[PDB]
């Protein structure tokens, strides 16, 4: 039974709410098949090596995101930046969980609310196929999502967001309460409910893939998926999206892996962990795009619109697609309950780790917070609840879009780039390899060291530069955000990107001694500062820098 338990642990570790909710609309937006060449390339080249590096860092140092930089004291700012990014994401992550819970509540009926026209939320333009370049939004399912759930029709833009929706308010309160009462005792929340939180996503994917293929218009969707538009690969938006999605789904750049692995057995094998997680992620993504495009090809056939106009490209694509596939199944109520229970469980499970990253990273930094976990968890959870309250208004989809685009984009890419720099170049890839050898019994191979030192930082810097210089103003499918919205988003990105130089400056000024002594204290591990008085700093020799 241990092998069954081991398989469940690995397979449930590999799946995340990002894979299920954020990949579909990123694949639809960037053409489908053309989105997986950058996706797989960046996976192989930067996602697997960096996942491995973060796992090994956390496991060896037994420290959270912030304090793990005792190995090079100038990068505690990088730690703080990743904690801030993880805090920012939860604001709207919990809002998606609230949407899932509202849909689950709506699903306990024999006449599902998203199948036909004529409800209190329907407009005069509602078009049911059964009875009877701009995106198509007059379908029963899209109108349900945008009028009976979001109540978006009561907003004009990000300048008139409105007041909180009380239904989503109650759902968000339930979600927040569950998260707190799951996080207030301790970190350990594995092996107790993962039997359903690990197998249900894959069962849902399997039934969706087997069914959608047998739909009237699925062939056209699969063709649009498998036809690769090589012109999209010269635009840099697909590359930016693929990089950000790799880091979103693998957990890198959020401080989640470091905090999670600080609890692993010292001898735990991180090589196999990275290999298995990345392989499962790649196969799952390539198989999930198939089902997405089969569903929306059938939607194109049924609604008689072009496959590039059937559905939104925003955060609600899954909530538009899953209902459409559900209504085509027999016993649609049972299937709706299964799908939305899966979504709710997966979202709660992943948001728990996202919040535990913040709690652990900041508690390992201050002992007062480590002795008072109940109050700290309350504070984190309540601040998240309010700043998400901002996202459940009438025009809260615009704020969720602004956050989704700016909270972890260039900011997360920069943070992970600085992590790779600080470890590989300053701490030493050779010392990092020695630590991995002491932990796991074998030294990392040449491919891993090359990716850690040269290849991954090079591509991360390329993507960061391109994202900064090739930046498209913000939109939601028909709506052009006012310029001050992009300025606000760039301020949000800089708010976490800038913690690095500020901490470097603070550390330099707070230290005592001469310039060279200050640099030596700044780039030397905290438990080797007594060598500085001996004027033996390895970073001050060319040999340390020419290593591989
Ligand atoms: O990234 C996450 C949750 N997450 C995603 C992917 C993972 C992969 C492996 C291990 C843990 C993981 C956790 C998050 C959630 C809410 C706020 C901020 C960050
Ligand atoms: Cl993904």
Swiss-Prot record:
Give an example GO cellular component term for this record: neuronal cell body membrane
**Per the record's keyword annotation, is 4Fe-4S included, yes or no?**
no
Per the entry, what this protein does is: Mediates sodium- and chloride-dependent transport of norepinephrine (also known as noradrenaline), the primary signaling neurotransmitter in the autonomic sympathetic nervous system. Is responsible for norepinephrine re-uptake and clearance from the synaptic cleft, thus playing a crucial role in norepinephrine inactivation and homeostasis. Can also mediate sodium- and chloride-dependent transport of dopamine.
Q: How is its activity regulated?
A: Inhibited by mazindol, desipramine, nomifensine and nortriptyline.
**Which portions of this protein are annotated as coiled-coil regions?**
none
Report the family membership.
Answer: Belongs to the sodium:neurotransmitter symporter (SNF) (TC 2.A.22) family. SLC6A2 subfamily.
InterPro entries under this entry? Na/ntran_symport, Na/ntran_symport_noradrenaline, SNS_sf
Q: What GO terms are given for molecular function?
A: actin binding; alpha-tubulin binding; beta-tubulin binding; dopamine:sodium symporter activity; metal ion binding; monoamine transmembrane transporter activity; neurotransmitter transmembrane transporter activity; neurotransmitter:sodium symporter activity
Positions with a binding annotation for (R)-noradrenaline 2: 28-29, 313
Name the reported effect of residue 251 to A.
Answer: Loss of norepinephrine binding
State any further remark. Answer: This protein is the target of psychomotor stimulants such as amphetamines or cocaine.
What residue intervals traverse the membrane?
4-29, 34-57, 77-107, 165-185, 189-213, 238-263, 270-293, 334-359, 375-395, 397-423, 454-476, 480-500
Alphabetically ordered keywords of this record: Cell membrane, Cell projection, Disease variant, Disulfide bond, Glycoprotein, Lipoprotein, Membrane, Metal-binding, Neurotransmitter transport, Palmitate, Sodium, Symport, Synapse, Synaptosome, Transmembrane, Transmembrane helix, Transport
Q: Which residues lie on this side of the membrane: Cytoplasmic?
A: 58-76, 186-188, 264-269, 360-374, 424-453, 501-548
Kindly provide the name given to this protein in its UniProt entry.
Sodium-dependent noradrenaline transporter
Q: Specify which residues bind (R)-noradrenaline 1 according to the UniProt entry for this protein.
A: 16, 86, 90, 248
Q: Which residues lie on this side of the membrane: Extracellular?
A: 30-33, 108-164, 214-237, 294-333, 396, 477-479
Locations listed in the record: Cell membrane; Cell projection, Axon; Synapse, Synaptosome
| Residues glycosylated per entry | 125
One Gene Ontology term from the biological process aspect of the record: neurotransmitter transport
């Amino acid at each position: 039974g241990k092998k069954i338990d081991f398989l469940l642990s690995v397979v449930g570790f590999a799946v995340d709410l990002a894979n299920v909710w954020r990949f579909p609309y990123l694949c639809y937006k960037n053409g489908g098949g053309a989105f997986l060449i950058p996706y797989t390339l960046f996976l192989i080249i930067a996602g697997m090596p960096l996942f491995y590096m973060e796992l090994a860092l956390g496991q060896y140092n037994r420290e959270g995101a912030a304090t793990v930089w005792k190995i090079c004291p100038f990068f505690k700012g990088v730690g703080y930046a990743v904690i801030l990014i993880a805090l920012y994401v939860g604001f709207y992550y919990n809002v998606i969980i609230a949407w899932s819970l509202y849909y689950l509540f709506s699903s306990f009926t024999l006449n599902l609310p998203w199948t036909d026209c004529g409800h209190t939320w329907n407009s005069p333009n509602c078009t049911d196929p059964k009875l009877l370049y701009s995106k198509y939004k007059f379908t029963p399912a899209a109108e349900f999502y945008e009028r009976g759930v979001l109540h978006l029709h009561e907003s004009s833009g990000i300048h008139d967001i409105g007041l909180p929706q009380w239904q989503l308010l109650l759902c968000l309160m339930v979600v927040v309460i569950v998260l707190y009462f799951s996080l207030w005792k301790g970190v350990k929340t594995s092996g107790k409910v993962v039997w359903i939180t690990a197998t249900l996503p894959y069962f849902v994917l399997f039934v969706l893939l087997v069914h959608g293929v047998t739909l009237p218009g699925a062939s056209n969707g699969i063709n649009a998926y498998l036809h690769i538009d090589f012109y999209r690969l010269k635009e840099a938006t697909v590359w930016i999206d693929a990089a950000t999605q790799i880091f979103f789904s693998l957990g890198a750049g959020f401080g989640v892996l470091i905090a999670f692995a600080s609890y692993n057995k010292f001898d735990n094998n991180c090589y196999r962990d990275a290999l298995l997680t990345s392989s499962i992620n790649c196969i799952t993504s390539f198989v999930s795009g198939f089902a997405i495009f089969s569903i929306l090809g059938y939607m194109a056939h049924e609604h008689k619109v072009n496959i590039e106009d059937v559905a939104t490209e925003g955060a609600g694509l899954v909530f538009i697609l899953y209902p459409e596939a559900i209504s085509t199944l027999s016993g649609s109520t049972f299937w709706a309950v299964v799908f939305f229970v899966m979504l709710l469980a997966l979202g709660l499970d992943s948001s728990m780790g996202g919040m535990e990253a913040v709690i652990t990273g900041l508690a390992d930094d201050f002992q007062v917070l480590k002795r008072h976990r109940k109050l700290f968890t309350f504070g984190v959870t309540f601040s998240t609840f309010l700043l998400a309250l901002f996202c459940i208004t009438k025009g809260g989809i615009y704020v969720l879009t602004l956050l989704d685009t700016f909270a972890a984009g260039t900011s997360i890419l920069f943070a992970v780039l600085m992590e790779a720099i600080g470890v590989s170049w300053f701490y030493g890839v050779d010392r990092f390899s020695n630590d991995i050898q002491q932990m796991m019994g074998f030294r990392p191979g040449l491919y891993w060291r090359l990716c850690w030192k040269f290849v991954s930082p090079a591509f991360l810097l390329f993507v960061v530069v391109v994202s900064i210089i090739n930046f498209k103003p913000l939109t939601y499918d028909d709506y052009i955000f006012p310029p001050w919205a992009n300025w606000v988003g760039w301020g949000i990105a800089l708010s976490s990107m800038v913690l690095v130089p500020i901490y470097v400056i603070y550390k330099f000024l707070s230290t005592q001694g001469s310039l060279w002594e200050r640099l030596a204290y700044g780039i030397t591990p905290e438990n080797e500062h007594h060598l500085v008085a001996q004027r033996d700093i390895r970073q001050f020799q060319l040999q340390h820098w020419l290593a591989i």
